[PDB]
Design a protein around this ligand. Structure first.
Ligand code: FMN
Ligand code: FMN
Ligand code: NPO
Ligand code: NPO
Lengths: 222, 218
């Protein structure tokens, strides 16, 4: 890393202040294919526990599907008509250490058989004892869903770095959204479920930050 | 504003560092900038349901080793360690949520309408109220946004990091509560992260191809 591959502290703070939730999009302004691919890359390159990458990104451009969405998506009703791109992020269901899904996770690490068994033993303990994820199907799904929020965050920040506005979205009926997207054939509902969404585009109305102070959220243990 | 190549370089510079140089410390100003990236993160309903515990005490780090397999050696060598807490019991009808509404400036009528909207969000749209753990996990998801932004902001400053789940969560929560750092009825440990400077080159790890993870619905 050097001064040319870094941002200054001033530039980092500007980036994270600029990143904001846009609720009014200009329908006449579309993100270029290349800029949007870059945004998706920010999601794809995100870290994830155990390298599990337990996400799928559905890019919902079809206008008829966006319209149907409106009736059960109160949190983005006024964005569905005018945003450039909409991403619905799915998270993997039943991502147990002993599942076929986890074999592919391991294969792309390029480990030998002994390293693979050492890794698997770590991941079993992580799920079973340390994080207690096998309490229920939902607990294990929510673990994958947490990893998807990393990908979400990175797509919002990457978009902001490109000068592109965005809004993270939880304001929809999850059962209705899962049912609709599965009925459209967009994923196997036994294997994935909706985690979170995000809109992207260019704002048509102005957005300053309101946050708790650093001293109210940070505690130093020296 | 950055070029596409610069944005890509940032996310490629960001890697999970397991081997830290124990002689390299992050400056106070750089670390405050990292914390700002967490503080400035978005969160559902603007709930900001997090606390960032900066664990620099060496005796406390040494105690954690016995139940933190995923960062055992990082604890000896990293510059800074953050344990992020998430709010427990963040119900729409809790005082925690009332404070959110008030500081947004909502009047009495608007607060009543907002309570109804977020009741519906939690009870029906997201079904967060199935159990205490489902509601906690909602706040925990928001903290993963703050985590991600800290890792990326650190990388932008030239500072290495590693997100951490590899510890016994209940033992960590018991320890940190015994230290008096939070009220365990109000918060619980969500995720951690180390920060510092790598002691060797970190081979870039693989990812599934874009075509594997993206589906276009046109
Ligand atoms: C939430 C989360 C928890 C993780 N926990 C650990 C951990 O405890 N110890 C560890 O060495 N790596 C941990 N990792 C790092 C992942 O193994 C790593 O992100 C993945 O292998 C991809 O490598 P990269 O981030 O270098 O691209 C974790 C990652 C995330 C996102
Ligand atoms: C996971 C998540 C879901 C959210 N859901 C919605 C939503 O459905 N609709 C909306 O208008 N804003 C939504 N927001 C945006 C938040 O209200 C916003 O992040 C917060 O008020 C802080 O504002 P800022 O992002 O402009 O800094 C969501 C944020 C997060 C992180
Ligand atoms: O050792 N561990 O508990 C780990 C190691 C890697 C990881 O991504 C998560 C947990
Ligand atoms: O309309 N909604 O459901 C919302 C709106 C804003 C938000 O942060 C979360 C949910």
């Amino acid at each position: 890393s050097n001064a040319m591959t870094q941002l200054t502290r001033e530039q980092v703070l500007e980036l994270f202040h600029q990143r904001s939730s846009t609720r009014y999009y200009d329908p006449a302004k579309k993100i270029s294919d290349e800029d949007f691919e870059c945004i998706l890359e920010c999601g794809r390159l995100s870290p994830s526990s155990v390298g599990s990458e337990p996400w799928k990104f559905l890019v919902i451009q079809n206008k008829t599907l966006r319209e149907k969405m409106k009736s059960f998506s109160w949190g983005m009703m006024n964005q569905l008509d005018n945003c450039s791109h909409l991403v619905v992020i799915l998270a993997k269901k039943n991502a147990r250490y002993d599942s076929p899904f986890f074999e592919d996770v391991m294969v792309r690490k390029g480990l030998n058989a002994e390293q693979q068994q050492a890794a698997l033993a770590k991941y079993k303990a992580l799920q079973e004892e340390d994080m207690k994820l096998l309490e229920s199907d939902r607990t294990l799904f929510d673990w994958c869903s947490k990893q998807t929020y990393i990908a979400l965050a990175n797509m919002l920040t990457g978009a902001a770095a490109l000068g592109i506005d965005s809004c993270p979205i939880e304001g929809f009926h999850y059962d209705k959204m899962n049912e609709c997207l599965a009925e459209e054939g967009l994923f196997d509902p036994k294997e994935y479920a909706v985690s979170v969404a995000a809109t992207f585009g260019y704002r048509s109305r102005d957005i300053k930050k309101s946050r708790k102070a650093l001293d109210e959220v940070v505690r130093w243990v020296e």
